[PDB]
Scaffold this active site. Structure first.
Site, PDB file in Angstrom:
ATOM      1  N   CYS A  33      -6.406  -0.995 -40.594  1.00 35.47           N
ATOM      2  CA  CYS A  33      -6.335  -2.063 -41.578  1.00 35.47           C
ATOM      3  C   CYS A  33      -7.701  -2.312 -42.195  1.00 35.47           C
ATOM      4  CB  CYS A  33      -5.792  -3.321 -40.900  1.00 35.47           C
ATOM      5  SG  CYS A  33      -6.032  -4.825 -41.861  1.00 35.47           S
ATOM      6  N   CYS A  36      -8.995  -5.906 -42.475  1.00 34.22           N
ATOM      7  CA  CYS A  36      -9.317  -6.332 -41.112  1.00 34.22           C
ATOM      8  C   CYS A  36     -10.694  -5.831 -40.713  1.00 34.22           C
ATOM      9  CB  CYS A  36      -8.312  -5.773 -40.108  1.00 34.22           C
ATOM     10  SG  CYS A  36      -6.580  -6.186 -40.436  1.00 34.22           S
TER      11      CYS A  36
END
Length: 107
Positions: A33, A36
């Protein structure tokens, strides 16, 4: 110290209880991600910057029940707790907006 990892669902409430009455900022994350990853360093710096609050990290696949009961739909998502009650939320990798809301709660 720093950002504390919650290794599985039953370890989550203990963490929320162990924050005492301190603000608790929980970063919901997952592997592979980009946002993230982009926000991770900043989040870690925020904890360094605010040792009066507690910073946690939950992977939504290691802690499915926690993700589901907090209605996590995307990552990264930051939840804010005080006395084990969710009082705020912030999605995304914009570090400025995130620290601004952490400051507003450190009120």
């Amino acid at each position: 110290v720093g950002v504390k990892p919650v290794g599985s669902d039953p370890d989550f409430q203990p963490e929320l209880s162990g924050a005492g009455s301190r603000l608790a900022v929980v970063k919901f994350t997952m592997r592979g991600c980009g946002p993230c990853l982009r926000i991770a360093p900043a989040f870690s710096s925020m904890s360094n910057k605010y040792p009066q609050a507690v910073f946690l990290e939950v992977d939504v696949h290691q802690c499915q029940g926690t993700a589901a009961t907090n209605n996590i739909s995307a990552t990264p998502t930051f939840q804010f707790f005080r006395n084990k009650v969710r009082i705020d939320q912030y999605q995304g990798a914009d570090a400025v907006g995130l620290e601004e809301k952490i400051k507003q709660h450190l009120e």
